Amino acid sequence: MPYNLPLPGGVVPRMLITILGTVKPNANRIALDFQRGNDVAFHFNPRFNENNRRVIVCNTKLDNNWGREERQSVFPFESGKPFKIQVLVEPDHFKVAVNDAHLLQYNHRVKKLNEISKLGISGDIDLTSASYTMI
Ligand SMILES: CC(=O)N[C@H]1[C@@H](O[C@H](C)[C@H](N)C(=O)O)O[C@H](CO)[C@H](O)[C@@H]1O[C@@H]1O[C@H](CO)[C@H](O)[C@H](O)[C@H]1O
Numbered sequence: 001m002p003y004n005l006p007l008p009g010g011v012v013p014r015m016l017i018t019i020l021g022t023v024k025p026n027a028n029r030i031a032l033d034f035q036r037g038n039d040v041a042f043h044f045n046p047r048f049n050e051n052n053r054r055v056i057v058c059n060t061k062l063d064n065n066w067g068r069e070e071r072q073s074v075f076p077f078e079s080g081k082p083f084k085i086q087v088l089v090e091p092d093h094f095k096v097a098v099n100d101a102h103l104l105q106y107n108h109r110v111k112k113l114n115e116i117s118k119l120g121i122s123g124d125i126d127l128t129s130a131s132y133t134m135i
Helices: none
Strands: 004-006 015-023 030-036 039-047 055-062 070-072 082-089 093-098 101-107 118-123 125-134
Touching: 004 125, 055 101, 070 101, 118 125
Parallel strands: none
Antiparallel strands: 004 118, 015 082, 015 125, 030 039, 030 118, 039 055, 055 070, 082 093, 093 101
Protein backbone atom coordinates (compact mmCIF):
# COMPACT_ATOMS: atom_id res chain seq x y z
CA MET A 1 0.00 0.00 0.00
CA PRO A 2 1.03 3.66 -0.61
CA TYR A 3 -0.26 6.78 1.23
CA ASN A 4 1.02 9.63 3.41
CA LEU A 5 -0.94 11.50 6.10
CA PRO A 6 0.71 14.93 6.53
CA LEU A 7 1.07 16.02 10.16
CA PRO A 8 1.56 19.79 9.92
CA GLY A 9 3.25 20.97 13.10
CA GLY A 10 4.46 17.46 13.79
CA VAL A 11 3.38 15.00 16.46
CA VAL A 12 2.22 16.50 19.76
CA PRO A 13 0.72 15.17 23.02
CA ARG A 14 -3.08 14.80 23.05
CA MET A 15 -3.02 14.14 19.32
CA LEU A 16 -5.26 11.21 18.31
CA ILE A 17 -4.80 9.63 14.87
CA THR A 18 -7.50 7.35 13.45
CA ILE A 19 -7.05 4.86 10.63
CA LEU A 20 -10.06 3.07 9.18
CA GLY A 21 -9.94 0.40 6.51
CA THR A 22 -10.38 -3.24 5.57
CA VAL A 23 -7.55 -5.78 5.54
CA LYS A 24 -7.17 -7.28 2.06
CA PRO A 25 -7.79 -10.98 1.42
CA ASN A 26 -4.68 -13.14 1.88
CA ALA A 27 -2.99 -10.20 3.61
CA ASN A 28 0.72 -10.51 4.34
CA ARG A 29 1.67 -7.26 6.05
CA ILE A 30 0.64 -3.82 7.23
CA ALA A 31 2.71 -0.89 8.18
CA LEU A 32 2.41 2.53 9.78
CA ASP A 33 5.53 4.66 9.51
CA PHE A 34 5.75 7.87 11.57
CA GLN A 35 8.61 9.67 9.85
CA ARG A 36 11.10 12.35 10.86
CA GLY A 37 13.14 13.16 7.76
CA ASN A 38 14.88 9.92 6.78
CA ASP A 39 14.36 8.44 10.25
CA VAL A 40 11.31 6.38 11.15
CA ALA A 41 10.32 7.42 14.67
CA PHE A 42 7.71 4.69 15.06
CA HIS A 43 7.24 1.66 12.80
CA PHE A 44 4.04 -0.35 13.48
CA ASN A 45 4.24 -3.55 11.42
CA PRO A 46 1.65 -6.35 11.72
CA ARG A 47 3.02 -9.48 10.01
CA PHE A 48 0.44 -12.13 9.12
CA ASN A 49 2.81 -15.02 8.48
CA GLU A 50 6.28 -15.17 9.97
CA ASN A 51 7.11 -18.87 10.31
CA ASN A 52 3.38 -19.58 10.68
CA ARG A 53 3.05 -17.09 13.52
CA ARG A 54 1.26 -13.75 13.44
CA VAL A 55 3.14 -10.93 15.10
CA ILE A 56 3.23 -7.16 15.40
CA VAL A 57 6.73 -5.76 15.06
CA CYS A 58 7.44 -2.25 16.30
CA ASN A 59 10.76 -0.44 15.85
CA THR A 60 12.60 2.81 15.11
CA LYS A 61 15.01 3.57 12.28
CA LEU A 62 17.76 6.02 12.95
CA ASP A 63 20.42 6.97 10.33
CA ASN A 64 19.23 4.13 8.10
CA ASN A 65 19.56 1.54 10.88
CA TRP A 66 16.70 -0.35 12.53
CA GLY A 67 16.91 -0.52 16.31
CA ARG A 68 15.78 -3.10 18.85
CA GLU A 69 12.43 -4.57 17.85
CA GLU A 70 9.52 -4.65 20.28
CA ARG A 71 7.22 -7.58 19.45
CA GLN A 72 3.56 -8.12 20.32
CA SER A 73 1.78 -11.46 19.76
CA VAL A 74 -1.73 -10.16 20.44
CA PHE A 75 -2.96 -9.85 16.84
CA PRO A 76 -6.51 -8.49 16.32
CA PHE A 77 -6.35 -8.18 12.50
CA GLU A 78 -8.08 -10.59 10.06
CA SER A 79 -7.77 -10.87 6.28
CA GLY A 80 -10.89 -9.44 4.65
CA LYS A 81 -12.14 -7.82 7.87
CA PRO A 82 -12.65 -4.10 8.62
CA PHE A 83 -10.41 -2.54 11.26
CA LYS A 84 -9.80 0.65 13.19
CA ILE A 85 -6.40 1.72 14.43
CA GLN A 86 -6.14 4.56 16.94
CA VAL A 87 -2.82 6.12 17.88
CA LEU A 88 -2.87 8.46 20.85
CA VAL A 89 0.24 10.54 21.36
CA GLU A 90 1.46 10.90 24.94
CA PRO A 91 4.56 12.82 26.07
CA ASP A 92 6.38 9.51 26.68
CA HIS A 93 4.88 7.02 24.26
CA PHE A 94 2.51 6.26 21.38
CA LYS A 95 -0.56 4.41 22.66
CA VAL A 96 -2.13 2.05 20.12
CA ALA A 97 -5.63 0.59 20.22
CA VAL A 98 -7.28 -1.55 17.54
CA ASN A 99 -11.03 -2.01 17.25
CA ASP A 100 -11.44 0.04 20.44
CA ALA A 101 -9.28 -2.29 22.52
CA HIS A 102 -5.89 -1.28 23.89
CA LEU A 103 -3.16 -3.14 22.01
CA LEU A 104 0.27 -1.77 22.85
CA GLN A 105 2.45 1.14 23.93
CA TYR A 106 5.66 2.26 22.21
CA ASN A 107 8.00 4.54 24.17
CA HIS A 108 9.40 7.47 22.21
CA ARG A 109 12.97 6.97 20.98
CA VAL A 110 12.84 10.01 18.69
CA LYS A 111 12.36 12.82 21.23
CA LYS A 112 11.64 15.83 18.99
CA LEU A 113 8.02 14.88 18.34
CA ASN A 114 7.49 18.20 16.55
CA GLU A 115 9.79 17.00 13.76
CA ILE A 116 7.69 13.98 13.08
CA SER A 117 6.08 15.50 9.99
CA LYS A 118 4.11 12.63 8.48
CA LEU A 119 2.60 9.17 8.83
CA GLY A 120 3.05 6.69 6.01
CA ILE A 121 0.34 4.05 5.70
CA SER A 122 1.12 0.95 3.64
CA GLY A 123 0.63 -2.79 3.30
CA ASP A 124 -2.26 -5.05 2.36
CA ILE A 125 -5.28 -2.89 3.20
CA ASP A 126 -8.04 -0.90 1.56
CA LEU A 127 -7.84 2.51 3.24
CA THR A 128 -11.13 4.24 4.03
CA SER A 129 -9.78 7.21 6.01
CA ALA A 130 -6.76 8.53 7.90
CA SER A 131 -7.26 11.57 10.13
CA TYR A 132 -6.29 13.21 13.41
CA THR A 133 -7.58 15.59 16.08
CA MET A 134 -6.85 16.71 19.65
CA ILE A 135 -8.61 15.43 22.77
C1 LIG B 1 12.75 -9.75 5.17
C2 LIG B 1 12.62 -9.70 6.56
O1 LIG B 1 11.39 -9.79 7.13
N1 LIG B 1 13.70 -9.56 7.32
C3 LIG B 1 13.62 -9.51 8.79
C4 LIG B 1 14.80 -10.31 9.36
O2 LIG B 1 16.02 -9.76 8.85
C5 LIG B 1 17.09 -10.72 8.94
C6 LIG B 1 18.29 -10.09 9.66
C7 LIG B 1 17.51 -11.17 7.54
N2 LIG B 1 17.70 -9.99 6.69
C8 LIG B 1 16.44 -12.07 6.92
O3 LIG B 1 15.31 -12.08 7.45
O4 LIG B 1 16.78 -12.74 5.91
O5 LIG B 1 14.78 -10.24 10.80
C9 LIG B 1 14.92 -8.89 11.26
C10 LIG B 1 14.93 -8.89 12.80
O6 LIG B 1 16.02 -9.69 13.27
C11 LIG B 1 13.75 -8.04 10.77
O7 LIG B 1 12.52 -8.56 11.29
C12 LIG B 1 13.70 -8.05 9.24
O8 LIG B 1 12.54 -7.37 8.75
C13 LIG B 1 12.68 -5.94 8.86
O9 LIG B 1 12.19 -5.51 10.13
C14 LIG B 1 12.25 -4.08 10.28
C15 LIG B 1 11.78 -3.66 11.67
O10 LIG B 1 12.66 -4.21 12.66
C16 LIG B 1 11.35 -3.42 9.23
O11 LIG B 1 10.01 -3.88 9.40
C17 LIG B 1 11.84 -3.80 7.83
O12 LIG B 1 10.95 -3.26 6.85
C18 LIG B 1 11.87 -5.32 7.71
O13 LIG B 1 12.44 -5.69 6.45
